Design a protein around this ligand. Structure first.
Ligand code: CHL
Ligand code: CHL
Ligand code: CLA
Ligand code: CLA
Ligand code: CLA
Ligand code: CLA
Ligand SMILES: CCCCCCCCCCCCCCCCCC(=O)OC[C@H](CO[C@@H]1O[C@H](CO)[C@H](O)[C@H](O)[C@H]1O)OC(=O)CCCCCCCCCCCCCCCCC
Ligand SMILES: CCCCCCCCCCCCCCCC(=O)OC[C@H](COP(=O)(O)OC[C@@H](O)CO)OC(=O)CCCCCCCCCCCCCCC
Ligand SMILES: CC(/C=C/C=C(C)/C=C/[C@@]12O[C@]1(C)C[C@@H](O)CC2(C)C)=C\C=C\C=C(C)\C=C\C=C(C)\C=C\[C@@]12O[C@]1(C)C[C@@H](O)CC2(C)C
Ligand SMILES: CC1=C[C@H](O)CC(C)(C)[C@H]1/C=C/C(C)=C/C=C/C(C)=C/C=C/C=C(C)/C=C/C=C(C)/C=C/C1=C(C)C[C@H](O)CC1(C)C
Ligand SMILES: CC1=C[C@H](O)CC(C)(C)[C@H]1/C=C/C(C)=C/C=C/C(C)=C/C=C/C=C(C)/C=C/C=C(C)/C=C/C1=C(C)C[C@H](O)CC1(C)C
Lengths: 238, 217, 220
């Protein structure tokens, strides 16, 4: 019905049927063609709506709103965390002299008497007091999150999840409402992937005990040799 | 209004409409209005960067830090190519927002605040002060680099050298002494030739026959 | 300070005008406007959660006092074969059993199964009576029955009743927080609460929790 170059995905700014796979009735669902009866409250109006409420926890619209905000905030924090749990180890295996690049050991760097050099450079942050660090952090993050929940110096009458003034959308990527609608989906999908992968970081720490990039490397060395089933008998009750 | 030399007559395009207008366009680089606006913005951008650079150099030479023409050679937390890549990536978006802001506003902005003016101090007196301090700081950085290339000393060390013997430790006793003396004399006698041109052709403007000027119109 | 209505104190203080939900009217004690998770949007679930909060609060107050008291009495002279609270239960397996205040003549419990059996019998009776009433009440409030549970009569005035409700739920939230702390810092430290305070007071800057931070690292 179309020509070759429209099939091949040319001609940007033809997007109103491309939101159909992420919003609306006939969108992609959590079990795909094997998920018939989506919850009636998951109408397809919000980003990331795949019809997954098996436990019915979001049946109330207001708790659904609160859960959406929880999801997006967790997603953003988990994206930052997934990037930050791999950046030091990547940089250390590329050769930056980070003293403890593994993430679940990265907090114990501040107890070495050379302090917490940021990239392993003593001329950088050079933090020694974990208590002063925590105090600074508590003050700043309390101000920050209280500003988030009602408003602050960066806009008060803005949305609770996507404020998008000149402080939180300073590149203007989301001025087109369709670009905004699909970027919301990209945000929530990358964020759900990051939350799953951060759960994976947690479990791979508690189970394996090495770094996540070290786990990737020892899996790529001999995958069938070394897997999560290698550590299946680790939590044996003795 | 004051001019760049006493009793000068500004060209036809330097109407005084702009700030810092002293009628100085002898090569007639700004006879086009779009070019003149772009050049005002480039003047201000080079001036802001030169102000920041002048204060940074004065700071790093006031304290026990390496000299500014060697600071790039020192060792840092990141290798120079990673620094260059992060700088390119950051400044692509930064100068892109600034370019959009120039195309819209005609003036400067950081990313999304078209005027970066949290503290609302955007007078036109303040624009004039920005422009004048920026010209002064552009000259100041040019001098920093020039008298750190002539000598191997920083700005305030060359200043101390001048103050130790002002009559014998100056630019006209340096390696660039005679060329600068000659260019200064030429500059001081230049405005009399320009005023001869203004005098013998009363109220007429002469095109200097340059490419950018389109002098045939 | 009001503690009720729209101009009540709230859990983010000045930051709290637009975070509170529409359903958290300042009607119930301790309503600081904290339902970020929206778990109390349904009024019935809200009522059940209020009951859970208050019962956990009362049990946690009793338990906080019961974990603090024997240790205080322990250093203040009294024999306590096992004073620390997270081993106070293992006294049954000792030679002389669980003597109450160290007195071999007070209780002298030797069998944990019989102790537990009596406990289930009377706790079930009492909690069933709590749910649906009994010898100390027929149709009273599920949370503030009164009558048999006000022999002193502190809360016959509604305003005193309200302020004491707030005091109750707040001391109880404090005790629940403190009991959670007891748990986590017993698991982390392995010592009692009073000894943890003594150690923190002996060297506050290097005897805090961060000294036990690298304790649970897997390390292959
Ligand atoms: C005044 C200082 C102020 C500071 C330092 C921050 C800082 C932050 N806010 Mg924030 N906010 C601040 C005011 C406000 N915020 C918000 C609403 C939000 C939201 C809704 C979110 C943040 C998030 C963040 C983080 C990511 C910033 C970002 O998106 O980078 C881009 C440039 C960062 C910690 C995000 C976050 O915490 O996820 C990890 C996030 O989702 N802020 C509001 C209400 C409009 C504010 C009002 O003043
Ligand atoms: C404007 C300043 C102000 C700020 C920032 C807060 C903030 C808070 N109040 Mg609040 N209040 C404030 C003013 C007032 N409060 C109150 C009355 C109350 C009450 C009654 C209560 C609060 C509570 C809270 C907390 C609810 C949010 C939360 O649970 O954090 C959650 C986020 C975290 C816990 C992050 C952790 C922070 C810290 C950095 C942890 C360190 C990280 C660890 C190392 C991680 C451990 C690693 C593990 C995983 C291995 C929060 C700390 C509630 C509370 O105490 O709950 C805890 C509560 O019950 N406030 C009054 C009286 C009217 C105020 C007056 O202005
Ligand atoms: C891939 C992840 C992703 C995606 C697609 C989005 C997408 C969006 N966000 Mg979200 N956001 C994310 C992650 C993401 N965000 C994270 C992790 C945070 C917390 C830091 C936020 C915080 C946030 C706020 C506070 C706001 C948005 C807004 C927006 C919208 C416009 C900006 C945009 O298009 O960004 C597109 C994203 C990219 C092109 C990715 C760039 C990759 C970065 C640079 C990698 C490096 C990370 C860096 C080093 C970490 C420091 C920070 C759009 C819906 C705004 C909005 O909707 O207003 C209209 C808004 O107000 N987001
Ligand atoms: C003497 C120096 C000077 C002066 C008078 C100004 C003056 C101005 N600037 Mg400029 N600016 C400067 C240096 C200066 N700037 C430098 C070095 C930078 C680079 C860091 C900038 C970057 C900059 C941006 C990006 C923007 C401005 C803007 C403005 C306007 C509002 C802010 C203001 O009044 O600043 C007051 C300045 C001071 C009180 C100087 C105090 C400095 C000491 C060290 C403290 C005003 C015309 C905004 C505008 O709309 O202008 C077109 C705008 O968007 N400036
Ligand atoms: C405002 C800028 C400024 C200032 C305050 C100075 C000041 C100084 N320079 Mg530098 N210099 C400058 C710009 C400046 N220069 C520029 C643009 C160049 C490139 C041509 C140089 C190149 C240069 C060399 C090569 C040498 C100096 C030297 C000197 C010292 C002796 C004066 C002299 O002979 O130079 C005269 C400078 C010029 C002829 C260049 C033009 C200067 C312009 C016209 C600005 C004049 C000052 C301005 C009107 C008002 C000053 C503002 C305020 C600070 C009071 C003195 C510390 C000498 C030195 O260090 O001796 C130990 C030396 O050897 N300078
Ligand atoms: C009000 C209740 C309360 C009180 C008085 C204490 C008091 C104490 N705790 Mg306990 N604790 C509590 C609640 C409390 N905790 C809770 C709720 C938890 C679970 C998260 C813990 C988990 C915990 C652990 C795992 C350990 C302690 C330890 C300690 C002792 C050292 C302090 C320390 O490391 O801080 C740790 C405090 C916390 C982890 C969270 C409590 C939050 C407080 C009440 C709010 C902040 C108030 C503070 C003064 C402001 C600081 C600002 C800035 C520096 C952050 C000290 C006697 C350590 C110990 O035994 O040392 C001898 C220890 O190993 N506590
Ligand atoms: C969050 C906090 C952010 C501010 C941090 C300020 C640091 C203060 C300090 O002590 O710096 C101290 C530092 C120098 O400190 C040096 O740091 C090096 C690594 O950078 C090495 O670790 C050296 O050991 C150390 O001496 O001073 C500066 O770097 C400031 C120079 C700024 C140069 C960049 C200008 C470009 C700006 C335009 C582009 C963006 C728009
Ligand atoms: C210090 C070194 C010596 C510097 C000498 C002076 C430099 C001249 C700089 C000119 C800037 C651009 C002029 C703006 C243009 C402008 O203002 O237009 C004015 C004029 C033509 O006017 P138009 O009629 O096109 O103008 C109409 C429009 O303005 C619309 O009204 O320009 C020319 O005639 C052509 C000039 C070409 C100049 C560029 C030549 C390239 C030289 C390099 C050669 C390299 C060869 C080797 C390759 C490996
Ligand atoms: C002098 C200057 C421009 C002078 C222009 C003049 C006179 C123009 C004159 C004319 O055009 C007109 C008006 C009209 C025409 O008809 C006639 C002429 C005559 C043609 C610009 C300087 C412009 C200067 C600028 C932009 C300086 C930026 C400096 C930076 C970034 C410094 C960075 C660092 O030094 C630090 C800070 C620390 C170090 O360790 C690292 C590094 C990187 C080395
Ligand atoms: C949907 C549904 C449906 C039905 O109905 C029901 C159900 C099932 C329930 C549901 C589901 C759900 C889910 C799955 C969830 C999940 C979550 C997660 C995973 C999260 C994470 C989450 C995650 C996260 C936040 C993360 C974060 C992170 C971070 C901060 C980080 C930090 C850090 C880093 C950087 C590193 C350094 O060195 C250290 C640290 C400090 C460590
Ligand atoms: C509000 C909100 C809001 C949003 O929306 C959401 C969320 C977040 C979810 C929420 C929150 C919540 C929380 C925080 C909770 C907590 C809880 C707790 C802590 C409890 C405790 C609790 C606690 C408790 C009970 C306690 C108890 C105690 C007891 C019994 C004791 C006992 C004992 C003792 C004496 C000692 C001895 O030797 C023995 C024993 C036997 C051991």
């Amino acid at each position: 019905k179309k020509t070759i170059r429209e099939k091949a995905g040319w001609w940007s700014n033809g997007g109103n049927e491309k939101l159909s796979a992420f919003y609306g009735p006939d969108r992609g669902l959590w079990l795909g063609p094997l998920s018939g009866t989506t919850p009636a409250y998951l109408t397809g109006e919000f980003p990331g709506d795949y019809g997954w409420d098996s436990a019915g926890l979001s049946a109330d619209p207001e708790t659904f709103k609160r859960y959406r905000e929880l999801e997006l905030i967790h997603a953003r924090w988990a994206m930052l965390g997934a990037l930050g749990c791999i950046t030091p180890e990547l940089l250390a295996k590329n050769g930056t002299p980070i003293v403890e690049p593994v993430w679940f050991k990265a907090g114990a760097q501040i107890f070495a008497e050379g302090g917490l050099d940021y990239l392993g450079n003593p001329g950088l942050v050079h933090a020694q007091s974990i208590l002063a660090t925590l105090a600074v952090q508590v003050i700043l993050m309390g101000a920050i999150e209280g500003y988030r929940v009602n408003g602050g110096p960066a806009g008060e009458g803005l949305d609770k999840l996507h404020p998008g003034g000149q402080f939180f959308d300073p590149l203007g990527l989301a001025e087109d409402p369709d670009a905004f609608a699909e970027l919301k989906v990209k945000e929530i999908k990358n964020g759900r992937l990051a939350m799953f992968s951060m759960f994976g970081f947690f479990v791979q720490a508690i189970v394996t005990g090495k770094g996540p990039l070290a786990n990737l490397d020892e899996h790529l060395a001999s995958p069938f040799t070394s897997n999560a089933f290698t550590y299946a008998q680790k939590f044996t009750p003795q | 209004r004051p001019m760049w030399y006493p009793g000068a007559t500004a060209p036809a395009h330097l109407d005084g409409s702009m700030l810092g207008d002293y009628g100085f366009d002898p090569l007639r680089l700004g006879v086009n209005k779009d070019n003149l606006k772009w050049f005002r913005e480039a003047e201000l951008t080079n001036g802001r960067w030169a102000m920041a650079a002048v204060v940074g150099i004065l700071f790093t030479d006031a304290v026990g830090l390496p000299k500014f023409w060697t600071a790039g050679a020192e060792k840092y937390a990141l290798d120079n190519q990673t620094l260059a890549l992060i700088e390119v990536a950051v400044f692509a978006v930064l100068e892109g927002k600034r370019y959009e802001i120039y195309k819209k506003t005609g003036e400067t902005g950081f990313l999304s605040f078209a005027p970066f003016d949290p503290m609302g101090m955007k007078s036109e007196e303040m624009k004039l002060k920005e422009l004048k301090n920026g010209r002064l700081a552009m000259l100041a950085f040019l001098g920093f680099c020039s008298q750190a290339a002539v000598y191997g000393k920083g700005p305030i060390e060359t200043l101390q050298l001048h103050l130790a013997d002002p009559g014998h430790n100056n630019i006209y006793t340096s390696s660039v002494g005679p060329e600068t003396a000659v260019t200064v004399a030429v500059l001081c006698v230049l405005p009399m030739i320009i005023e001869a041109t203004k005098t013998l052709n009363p109220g007429k403007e002469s095109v200097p026959y340059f490419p950018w000027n389109e002098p045939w119109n | 300070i009001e503690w009720y209505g729209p101009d009540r104190p709230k859990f983010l203080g000045p930051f709290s005008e637009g975070d509170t939900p529409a359903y958290l009217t300042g009607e119930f004690p301790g309503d600081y406007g904290w339902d970020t998770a929206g778990l109390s949007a349904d009024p019935e679930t809200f009522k059940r959660y209020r009951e859970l909060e208050l019962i956990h609060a009362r049990w946690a107050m009793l338990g906080a006092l019961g974990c603090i008291t024997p240790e205080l009495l322990a250093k203040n002279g009294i024999p306590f074969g096992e004073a620390v609270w997270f081993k106070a239960g293992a006294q049954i397996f000792a030679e002389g059993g669980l003597n109450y205040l160290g007195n071999e003549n007070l209780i002298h419990a030797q069998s944990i199964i019989a102790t537990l059996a009596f406990q289930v019998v009377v706790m079930g009776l009492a909690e069933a009576y709590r749910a649906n009433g009994g010898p100390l009440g027929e149709g009273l409030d599920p949370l503030h029955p009164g009558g048999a549970f006000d022999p002193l009569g502190l809360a016959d005035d509604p305003d005193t009743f309200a302020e004491l409700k707030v005091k109750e739920i707040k001391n109880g939230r404090l005790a629940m927080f403190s009991m959670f702390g007891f748990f986590v810092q017993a698991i982390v430290t392995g010592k009692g609460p009073i000894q943890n305070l003594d150690d923190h007071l002996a060297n506050p800057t290097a005897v805090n929790a961060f000294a036990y931070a690298t304790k649970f690292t897997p390390s292959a």
